[PDB]
């Protein structure tokens, strides 16, 4: 697999992912990654993005997720199914997301990572997601809706 | 006088520590039988004599 | 699972049980509990009953064993089979139970735990079990027949 | 199991063999032994033989490979295929050996350990192996061709 | 019969055998031989080999087992079945024999006694036996694997 759940007391409270040769885990998710090879690397803080990162082991650098900055309007998928990307917001039907789904990447129709979900806001019809994505210039940006809650 | 006061303070400390230790150990020994039995009568008098 | 083995050097050195929201394991058994959720619990010592106890995580409280003190004469069930209760003593056929079986629970025909097996007596044809149970008032008591040895 | 792989970063980088009731592992192969009990025993160093050794656990004393000092001209086998012994030298077909095969014993037609492989040299026609074997006197003797690469 | 049980309180503590014209029994075996003709014999304490011995009465001279020092590697017979001897070691499968079996003789394919069992060591799937044997020159010696428990 490519996504590695993060476990604190034997329970999953988040998910780590490997993108472009880097291991990304949410900063607010405390615990150890359910692995031995990826868990032995020291991780750097990225508090401006609520993320942590580290270098993938040499034997693991090839088995990593690809990402893209091109996010045309339409439907995207993730672990829990389809995700709608419109009006510059990632959103899922009410109740689809919830606490624990922190660090789960969102994938496009080509299997490329487009965003890392950190939280969300429940709107009238769909729940908006707080994610770390890349703008049209490929620069890492934290796109969060108003009143988002960490998951 | 210096020796007497130091001896009295040492005696007081040792005796108070021993007394408190014995009383706390008594509370632990008296209450432990009921902690391992949540569905017990736990008479009110128990909370007055052993606590 | 209601019974969790305790491993010292990779071998099972006893079993830990969760009853009514509390976990018990033999005080004389060294090693870690083979459960991440239970291994993280800091237990208090109860030298009167030769056991350690503590509370369990909120996820386990919903499925803990039910305490009962109604112990009429007859046959009771346990991991290795049936258990005979006579003269206010728990006994089993010779060869049933031994080193490493300490901490196993004894239950009635209603699924309620009546005693925790900590040891026993090796007789010519039968064995007597050294167990922790409750009296007619529901107060914890330790029954150690003469010659009982911890398992 | 009598031959256990050695892992450093999660991948196998060699083998530790239980022969004669004793553990034989190369010194240049760093990492823990696959078996937890073989990794828990303190081992001694034999730099003159490029191998590390120690007494096996009680249960492993009988479940061990027997060894023989008699290696007449003929064919032998290992996990990479057949091994040919000629001119007192262990030669394998071109390309058969390689990194990670160190520590694997060469077995005779009776399943007895004849030599432990440590490295080899590609001669352009066949590959010569660096092995640890026993001479006509039954004394441990290292035999390595000049320029051999530790595997 | 050439083997006689030794009983202290009615339970079998060991066995005695007549080999070469002498009655043999271990020092650690307590009790009396069922045959009064042998029990009345004053036995010499050969603490060097943990054996008691005496002269066979003329009335019992016919009940004598032949012995030999020619013990090549192979399988030997005794009261519990076959016995495997290799590398100057006597071995039986685990669970074959135990306390009370000391003093039993081991016979070759010709019915000649080659060893007397004193105890053994459980080595995984096999149990090694402590035996009294004659070396290649026919001299009585005691073979004791480390940690052997007298039977």
XYZ file of C-alpha atoms in Angstrom:
655
model
C 0.000 0.000 0.000
C 0.908 3.694 -0.152
C -1.150 5.139 2.735
C 0.025 4.217 6.243
C -2.438 4.780 9.120
C -1.093 6.569 12.197
C -1.822 4.756 15.466
C -1.500 6.180 18.988
C -2.801 3.543 21.440
C -3.494 0.756 18.966
C -6.234 2.786 17.255
C -6.143 4.704 13.985
C -6.458 8.471 14.511
C -5.134 9.575 11.125
C -3.292 8.517 8.006
C 0.191 9.209 6.681
C 0.853 9.319 2.947
C 3.906 9.342 0.693
C 3.844 11.917 -2.115
C 6.630 12.475 -4.629
C 9.153 10.776 -2.362
C 8.164 12.555 0.869
C 6.185 11.177 3.812
C 3.419 13.591 4.835
C 1.573 13.305 8.141
C -0.727 15.867 9.785
C 0.930 17.863 12.544
C -2.085 17.757 14.887
C -2.266 13.938 14.673
C -0.087 12.590 17.491
C 1.099 8.995 17.403
C 3.369 6.576 15.587
C 2.966 5.471 11.981
C 1.945 1.820 11.708
C 5.257 0.867 10.096
C 8.895 0.125 10.882
C 10.700 1.505 7.828
C 8.850 4.828 7.543
C 8.586 5.232 11.331
C 12.375 5.371 11.830
C 12.904 8.630 9.884
C 13.021 11.950 11.714
C 10.241 14.275 10.536
C 10.474 18.043 10.072
C 7.697 20.403 11.142
C 5.643 22.532 8.739
C 3.388 24.225 11.288
C 2.310 26.820 8.719
C 0.590 23.927 6.909
C -0.169 21.729 9.954
C 2.027 19.112 8.283
C 5.199 17.179 9.007
C 7.557 15.778 6.396
C 10.630 13.598 6.028
C 12.703 11.823 3.420
C 11.448 8.466 2.146
C 13.960 5.617 2.630
C 16.019 4.865 -0.462
C 14.314 1.486 -0.888
C 10.890 3.183 -0.696
C 11.418 6.294 -2.850
C 10.107 4.490 -5.944
C 6.854 3.289 -4.325
C 5.312 6.721 -3.811
C 2.255 8.647 -4.961
C 2.368 11.135 -7.823
C 0.681 14.526 -7.534
C -0.462 17.256 -9.904
C -1.312 20.939 -9.613
C -3.933 20.821 -12.398
C -7.330 20.503 -10.679
C -10.044 21.137 -13.271
C -13.581 21.473 -11.886
C -15.343 18.146 -11.528
C -15.442 15.046 -9.350
C -12.485 13.530 -7.492
C -12.192 10.401 -5.355
C -10.639 9.374 -2.056
C -10.861 6.503 0.428
C -14.555 7.162 1.146
C -15.620 7.562 -2.500
C -16.333 10.545 -4.718
C -15.324 14.098 -3.792
C -16.683 17.210 -5.501
C -14.239 19.997 -6.404
C -16.121 23.152 -7.371
C -15.985 26.842 -6.482
C -12.389 26.306 -5.299
C -13.636 24.042 -2.491
C -13.330 20.319 -1.830
C -16.609 18.962 -0.492
C -18.220 15.623 0.359
C -21.856 14.724 1.151
C -22.921 15.472 4.714
C -21.655 12.831 7.125
C -19.253 11.178 4.675
C -16.239 12.690 6.437
C -15.427 12.949 10.111
C -12.786 12.810 12.795
C -9.938 10.413 12.019
C -9.807 11.177 8.280
C -6.731 13.383 8.663
C -3.903 12.947 6.179
C -5.945 10.919 3.701
C -5.035 12.081 0.175
C -7.599 12.904 -2.493
C -7.042 11.340 -5.911
C -8.085 12.461 -9.380
C -9.314 10.306 -12.272
C -5.661 9.509 -13.081
C -4.627 8.291 -9.622
C -2.612 11.430 -8.846
C -2.713 13.080 -5.430
C -4.435 16.464 -5.575
C -4.842 17.340 -1.881
C -4.288 16.133 1.680
C -7.394 16.411 3.863
C -6.878 17.936 7.321
C -10.417 18.853 8.385
C -13.770 20.125 7.221
C -16.926 22.177 7.676
C -20.459 20.768 7.456
C -22.509 22.979 5.137
C -26.229 22.883 4.404
C -25.912 20.099 1.823
C -22.257 18.987 1.753
C -19.277 19.009 4.103
C -16.406 21.209 2.948
C -12.914 19.845 3.571
C -9.837 21.653 4.887
C -6.981 20.455 2.674
C -3.372 21.187 1.761
C -3.127 21.660 -2.007
C -1.021 23.324 -4.694
C -2.190 26.447 -6.514
C -2.055 26.998 -10.269
C 1.647 27.860 -9.850
C 2.392 24.602 -8.021
C 3.126 26.287 -4.684
C 1.959 24.569 -1.514
C -1.030 26.393 -0.013
C -3.389 25.632 2.866
C -6.977 25.928 1.601
C -9.359 25.935 4.558
C -13.042 26.908 4.777
C -14.443 29.202 7.442
C -14.616 27.492 10.825
C -12.879 24.263 9.834
C -12.262 21.726 12.589
C -9.149 19.514 12.731
C -9.922 15.839 12.199
C 18.511 22.561 73.963
C 19.678 22.275 70.348
C 19.976 18.490 70.626
C 16.615 18.228 72.374
C 14.756 20.263 69.768
C 16.377 18.388 66.879
C 15.516 15.052 68.509
C 11.914 16.141 69.083
C 11.515 17.274 65.470
C 13.041 14.033 64.172
C 10.744 11.992 66.425
C 7.713 13.996 65.292
C 8.569 13.542 61.617
C 9.230 9.804 61.935
C 6.069 9.273 63.989
C 3.842 11.351 61.706
C 5.185 9.588 58.617
C 4.623 6.196 60.255
C 1.116 7.150 61.417
C 0.082 8.500 58.015
C 1.649 5.505 56.263
C -0.250 3.077 58.494
C -3.530 4.965 58.049
C -3.168 5.207 54.260
C -2.213 1.532 54.036
C -5.274 0.766 56.157
C -7.452 2.714 53.729
C -5.947 0.888 50.746
C -6.417 -2.537 52.343
C -9.960 -1.714 53.490
C -11.179 -0.203 50.209
C -9.411 -2.469 47.683
C -11.866 -5.347 48.354
C -14.666 -3.063 47.127
C -12.902 -1.452 44.156
C -12.626 -4.878 42.511
C -16.392 -5.321 43.080
C -18.251 -2.369 41.534
C -21.648 -3.964 42.280
C -21.301 -3.989 46.063
C -23.293 -2.540 48.939
C -20.411 -0.289 50.052
C -22.038 0.681 53.378
C -21.845 4.368 54.251
C -20.094 3.446 57.502
C -17.242 2.044 55.406
C -16.641 5.499 53.912
C -16.545 6.958 57.447
C -14.205 4.546 59.270
C -11.717 3.576 56.533
C -11.540 7.018 54.876
C -11.680 -11.455 22.711
C -12.203 -11.747 26.469
C -8.826 -13.291 27.391
C -5.483 -11.750 26.402
C -2.185 -13.665 26.748
C 0.766 -12.087 28.549
C 4.139 -12.669 26.873
C 7.474 -12.401 28.700
C 10.116 -13.552 26.182
C 7.715 -14.513 23.393
C 6.098 -17.333 25.388
C 2.755 -16.983 27.156
C 3.254 -16.468 30.904
C -0.391 -15.918 31.857
C -3.624 -14.292 30.766
C -5.251 -10.920 31.461
C -9.030 -10.475 31.651
C -11.366 -7.473 31.463
C -14.423 -7.578 33.734
C -16.974 -4.814 34.271
C -14.695 -2.151 32.828
C -11.655 -3.302 34.827
C -8.681 -5.418 33.752
C -7.005 -7.982 36.016
C -3.778 -9.930 35.566
C -1.724 -12.054 37.984
C 0.634 -9.973 40.104
C 3.307 -12.703 40.011
C 3.322 -12.896 36.179
C 6.000 -10.822 34.442
C 5.773 -9.596 30.861
C 3.755 -7.368 28.577
C 0.089 -7.842 27.746
C -0.304 -8.948 24.119
C -2.654 -6.055 23.370
C -1.672 -2.496 22.484
C -4.799 -1.071 24.127
C -4.333 -2.983 27.389
C -0.530 -2.720 27.462
C -0.900 1.073 27.747
C -2.952 0.885 30.974
C -1.097 1.633 34.211
C -2.496 -0.783 36.798
C -2.654 -0.521 40.583
C -1.365 -3.297 42.834
C -3.648 -5.313 45.143
C -1.354 -7.618 47.114
C -4.361 -9.003 49.010
C -5.547 -10.668 45.791
C -2.140 -11.138 44.106
C -3.403 -9.141 41.125
C -3.147 -5.746 39.443
C -6.176 -3.774 38.274
C -7.141 -0.675 36.325
C -9.702 0.839 33.988
C -9.944 0.001 30.281
C -10.354 2.261 27.216
C -13.810 3.577 26.375
C -13.927 1.289 23.327
C -13.652 -1.859 25.480
C -15.973 -0.890 28.350
C -19.015 -1.803 26.238
C -17.981 -5.482 25.982
C -16.538 -6.335 29.406
C -17.430 -9.431 31.410
C -20.339 -9.226 33.856
C -19.624 -9.709 37.562
C -21.759 -12.135 39.558
C -21.579 -13.565 43.081
C -24.334 -16.213 42.793
C -22.257 -19.411 43.094
C -24.567 -22.363 43.807
C -23.051 -25.860 43.910
C -22.676 -27.475 40.510
C -20.547 -27.402 37.375
C -19.087 -24.242 35.836
C -17.389 -23.514 32.514
C -13.863 -22.268 31.881
C -11.330 -22.145 29.056
C -10.112 -25.740 29.442
C -13.592 -27.193 29.983
C -15.947 -27.656 32.921
C -15.180 -26.818 36.553
C -16.749 -28.510 39.578
C -17.821 -26.323 42.510
C -18.255 -28.231 45.778
C -17.576 -27.473 49.445
C -17.063 -23.858 48.325
C -14.044 -25.050 46.325
C -13.346 -25.101 42.584
C -11.777 -28.332 41.328
C -11.004 -29.843 37.925
C -9.797 -33.219 36.643
C -6.084 -33.903 36.924
C -4.156 -32.570 33.942
C -6.611 -29.708 33.321
C -4.740 -26.486 34.059
C -1.130 -25.743 34.874
C 1.716 -23.267 34.671
C 0.767 -20.352 32.435
C -2.998 -20.763 32.915
C -3.143 -18.297 35.817
C -5.626 -15.452 35.433
C -8.120 -17.408 33.337
C -11.778 -16.721 34.208
C -14.448 -19.141 35.395
C -17.995 -18.437 34.222
C -21.463 -19.799 34.926
C -24.019 -20.894 32.318
C -25.143 -17.255 31.919
C -21.772 -15.913 30.740
C -21.003 -14.168 34.046
C -17.580 -14.527 35.662
C -17.514 -16.088 39.129
C -13.784 -16.495 39.854
C -10.293 -15.826 38.501
C -7.937 -18.819 38.511
C -4.520 -17.859 39.910
C -3.224 -21.306 40.854
C -4.147 -24.700 42.189
C -3.252 -27.886 44.038
C -1.958 -30.965 42.194
C -3.621 -33.985 43.818
C -3.523 -37.658 42.882
C -6.670 -37.669 40.736
C -8.065 -34.110 40.913
C -6.849 -30.555 41.406
C -8.107 -27.703 43.572
C -7.980 -24.183 42.142
C -6.710 -21.136 44.032
C -9.087 -18.427 42.833
C -10.273 -14.913 43.643
C -14.048 -14.611 43.971
C -16.764 -12.734 45.856
C -18.697 -13.726 48.968
C -22.466 -13.566 49.472
C -22.093 -9.811 50.093
C -20.213 -9.223 46.834
C -16.873 -8.429 48.506
C -13.685 -9.653 46.859
C -12.084 -12.608 48.646
C -9.105 -14.823 47.830
C -9.501 -18.586 48.305
C -6.147 -20.392 48.608
C -6.536 -24.052 49.612
C -3.660 -25.444 51.651
C -0.753 -26.295 49.367
C -1.910 -24.046 46.524
C 0.852 -22.927 44.169
C 0.666 -20.028 41.688
C 0.404 -21.085 38.052
C 13.536 -23.785 9.952
C 17.325 -24.122 10.082
C 18.509 -21.165 7.952
C 17.156 -17.750 8.948
C 17.474 -14.527 6.913
C 18.996 -11.367 8.372
C 17.212 -8.032 7.919
C 18.637 -4.532 8.385
C 16.140 -2.038 6.907
C 13.289 -4.500 6.362
C 14.991 -6.181 3.391
C 17.095 -9.331 3.575
C 20.847 -8.674 3.408
C 22.105 -12.145 4.314
C 21.397 -15.315 6.251
C 22.139 -16.790 9.672
C 22.492 -20.575 9.666
C 21.954 -22.997 12.548
C 24.577 -25.678 11.846
C 26.040 -28.084 14.375
C 23.849 -26.590 17.081
C 25.511 -23.187 16.738
C 24.646 -19.972 14.907
C 26.857 -19.028 11.952
C 26.329 -15.557 10.487
C 28.712 -13.369 8.456
C 30.298 -10.388 10.177
C 29.786 -8.026 7.221
C 26.004 -8.669 7.367
C 24.597 -6.182 9.883
C 21.060 -6.479 11.228
C 18.819 -8.657 13.384
C 18.145 -12.343 12.785
C 14.704 -13.285 11.481
C 14.137 -15.539 14.492
C 13.610 -13.469 17.632
C 15.238 -16.084 19.873
C 18.381 -16.306 17.732
C 18.655 -12.504 17.778
C 18.335 -12.422 21.587
C 21.496 -14.500 22.224
C 24.897 -12.846 22.566
C 27.279 -13.903 19.785
C 31.077 -14.071 19.571
C 33.248 -12.717 16.755
C 35.739 -14.685 14.623
C 37.368 -12.044 12.427
C 39.756 -14.609 10.927
C 36.658 -16.371 9.542
C 34.496 -13.291 8.820
C 31.675 -14.895 10.825
C 29.862 -14.433 14.137
C 28.677 -17.334 16.280
C 26.859 -18.292 19.459
C 25.050 -21.145 21.153
C 21.481 -21.711 19.934
C 18.426 -21.822 22.235
C 17.681 -25.051 24.082
C 14.949 -25.980 21.594
C 17.293 -25.355 18.640
C 20.034 -27.679 19.915
C 18.573 -30.705 18.108
C 16.845 -28.896 15.210
C 20.143 -28.032 13.537
C 22.007 -28.932 10.364
C 24.773 -31.501 10.660
C 28.068 -30.714 8.952
C 30.683 -32.821 7.190
C 34.320 -32.178 6.303
C 34.309 -34.574 3.321
C 33.685 -32.722 0.040
C 34.769 -34.936 -2.872
C 34.487 -33.663 -6.454
C 30.847 -33.470 -7.469
C 27.706 -31.362 -7.240
C 26.154 -29.582 -4.252
C 23.077 -27.389 -3.870
C 21.852 -24.146 -2.323
C 18.846 -21.856 -2.708
C 20.227 -20.359 -5.946
C 20.554 -23.743 -7.674
C 23.277 -26.360 -8.029
C 26.880 -25.848 -6.904
C 29.823 -27.545 -8.623
C 33.003 -28.435 -6.719
C 36.191 -28.953 -8.724
C 39.918 -28.451 -8.159
C 39.074 -27.915 -4.472
C 37.112 -24.787 -5.485
C 33.372 -24.083 -5.262
C 32.225 -22.749 -8.646
C 28.673 -21.790 -9.638
C 27.319 -21.009 -13.135
C 27.776 -17.483 -14.472
C 25.492 -14.986 -12.746
C 23.929 -17.450 -10.297
C 25.322 -15.781 -7.172
C 25.017 -12.205 -6.032
C 24.415 -9.728 -3.246
C 22.439 -11.122 -0.317
C 23.434 -14.785 -0.695
C 26.073 -14.683 2.056
C 25.501 -17.044 4.968
C 23.632 -19.678 2.960
C 25.242 -23.107 3.522
C 26.097 -25.503 0.709
C 24.477 -28.893 1.314
C 25.605 -32.328 0.146
C 23.446 -35.234 -1.055
C 22.613 -36.048 2.594
C 21.483 -32.580 3.688
C 24.678 -31.862 5.643
C 26.439 -28.498 5.604
C 29.642 -28.573 3.557
C 30.541 -24.869 3.413
C 29.135 -21.414 4.172
C 29.198 -18.930 1.283
C 30.545 -15.412 1.891
C 31.233 -13.956 -1.558
C 32.462 -14.717 -5.037
C 34.301 -13.724 -8.202
C 32.990 -13.768 -11.764
C 35.719 -15.363 -13.892
C 33.864 -14.790 -17.185
C 32.939 -18.479 -17.559
C 31.898 -19.541 -14.052
C 31.688 -17.830 -10.667
C 33.947 -18.868 -7.795
C 32.487 -18.531 -4.302
C 34.235 -17.361 -1.153
C 33.327 -20.020 1.399
C 34.059 -21.098 4.953
C 34.676 -24.842 5.055
C 36.608 -27.550 6.886
C 39.901 -29.095 5.807
C 40.892 -32.757 5.791
C 41.623 -32.368 9.522
C 38.138 -31.049 10.306
C 39.458 -27.602 11.259
C 37.545 -24.519 10.154
C 39.290 -23.001 7.131
C 38.349 -19.938 5.083
C 38.780 -20.204 1.304
C 38.352 -17.000 -0.715
C 39.629 -16.254 -4.238
C 41.621 -13.080 -4.761
C 39.394 -10.074 -5.381
C 36.248 -11.732 -4.027
C 33.399 -9.367 -3.209
C 31.613 -9.872 0.135
C 27.963 -10.678 -0.530
C 13.231 -61.557 33.247
C 16.561 -59.714 33.250
C 15.257 -56.271 34.294
C 13.723 -55.778 37.737
C 11.795 -52.685 38.891
C 12.915 -50.782 41.983
C 10.093 -49.574 44.237
C 10.343 -47.575 47.468
C 6.678 -47.178 48.493
C 5.063 -49.295 45.771
C 5.835 -46.824 42.973
C 8.531 -47.552 40.403
C 11.612 -45.418 41.081
C 13.932 -47.088 38.570
C 15.052 -50.358 37.049
C 17.897 -52.782 37.683
C 19.518 -55.003 35.063
C 21.997 -57.882 34.978
C 24.811 -57.125 32.521
C 27.932 -59.237 32.093
C 27.281 -61.023 35.382
C 26.791 -57.941 37.578
C 23.626 -56.285 38.883
C 23.436 -52.574 38.033
C 21.276 -49.814 39.487
C 21.733 -46.034 39.791
C 22.668 -44.429 43.093
C 19.761 -41.969 42.920
C 17.165 -44.765 42.641
C 15.679 -45.437 46.081
C 13.725 -48.523 47.102
C 14.091 -52.292 47.012
C 14.362 -54.638 44.043
C 11.293 -56.853 43.696
C 13.550 -59.909 43.327
C 14.647 -60.817 46.849
C 17.600 -62.736 45.399
C 19.029 -59.429 44.146
C 17.747 -57.107 46.883
C 19.659 -59.102 49.515
C 22.968 -58.486 47.706
C 25.291 -55.915 49.264
C 26.047 -53.393 46.514
C 29.238 -51.370 46.126
C 28.848 -47.605 45.710
C 30.621 -46.589 42.488
C 30.080 -42.862 42.954
C 32.353 -42.287 39.943
C 29.506 -43.511 37.702
C 26.434 -43.148 39.957
C 25.997 -46.934 39.902
C 25.574 -49.634 42.543
C 26.866 -53.081 41.615
C 27.258 -56.568 43.031
C 27.922 -60.174 42.084
C 25.065 -62.150 40.524
C 24.081 -65.149 42.697
C 24.859 -68.569 41.263
C 21.109 -69.249 41.133
C 20.690 -66.134 38.948
C 23.816 -66.520 36.790
C 21.703 -67.649 33.821
C 19.727 -64.365 33.816
C 22.654 -62.324 32.487
C 22.682 -59.982 29.490
C 25.683 -59.875 27.176
C 27.269 -56.467 26.576
C 29.629 -55.072 23.951
C 31.709 -51.971 23.264
C 31.114 -52.057 19.481
C 28.453 -49.344 19.147
C 28.486 -47.956 15.595
C 26.124 -45.110 14.662
C 22.579 -46.302 14.094
C 19.391 -47.252 15.913
C 19.194 -49.276 19.129
C 16.296 -50.848 21.017
C 15.071 -50.438 24.585
C 11.857 -50.859 26.569
C 10.337 -47.698 25.037
C 11.279 -48.513 21.434
C 14.083 -47.443 19.119
C 16.993 -45.256 20.231
C 19.123 -43.226 17.815
C 22.863 -42.897 18.497
C 24.977 -40.437 16.511
C 28.033 -38.234 17.044
C 28.764 -40.069 20.309
C 25.307 -39.043 21.568
C 22.283 -41.146 22.525
C 18.959 -39.549 21.616
C 15.270 -40.450 21.845
C 12.190 -38.552 20.648
C 10.791 -36.091 23.163
C 8.288 -37.686 25.518
C 9.785 -41.181 25.174
C 10.951 -41.993 28.690
C 11.146 -39.970 31.864
C 11.511 -40.142 35.621
C 11.585 -43.781 36.689
C 13.212 -45.075 33.493
C 16.794 -44.780 34.749
C 18.669 -48.076 34.798
C 17.042 -49.459 31.655
C 19.512 -51.085 29.226
C 19.922 -50.296 25.534
C 20.357 -53.260 23.193
C 21.877 -53.527 19.721
C 20.714 -55.644 16.772
C 22.178 -58.753 18.467
C 20.587 -58.240 21.883
C 23.794 -57.013 23.531
C 23.590 -54.203 26.076
C 25.480 -51.121 24.906
C 24.442 -48.571 27.554
C 22.553 -47.964 30.795
C 20.304 -44.899 30.973
C 20.737 -42.532 33.928
C 18.799 -39.491 32.737
C 18.440 -37.129 29.830
C 18.048 -33.659 28.363
C 15.072 -32.527 26.285
C 16.507 -30.873 23.154
C 13.515 -29.625 21.203
C 11.932 -32.460 19.247
C 14.440 -34.949 20.714
C 15.659 -35.896 24.190
C 19.340 -36.655 24.793
C 20.111 -39.395 27.323
C 22.761 -39.562 30.030
C 24.200 -43.074 29.719
C 27.021 -45.232 31.051
C 28.932 -46.685 28.106
C 32.234 -48.333 27.248
C 34.685 -46.426 25.067
C 36.411 -47.778 21.966
C 38.751 -49.685 24.320
C 35.915 -51.089 26.444
C 36.540 -48.850 29.471
C 33.461 -47.829 31.449
C 32.639 -44.121 31.122
C 29.752 -41.813 32.009
C 28.237 -39.581 29.313
C 26.261 -36.631 30.703
C 24.780 -33.934 28.447
C 24.846 -30.546 30.140
C 21.783 -30.046 32.323
C 20.734 -33.705 32.291
C 18.094 -34.537 34.897
C 18.409 -37.943 36.613
C 15.428 -40.178 35.881
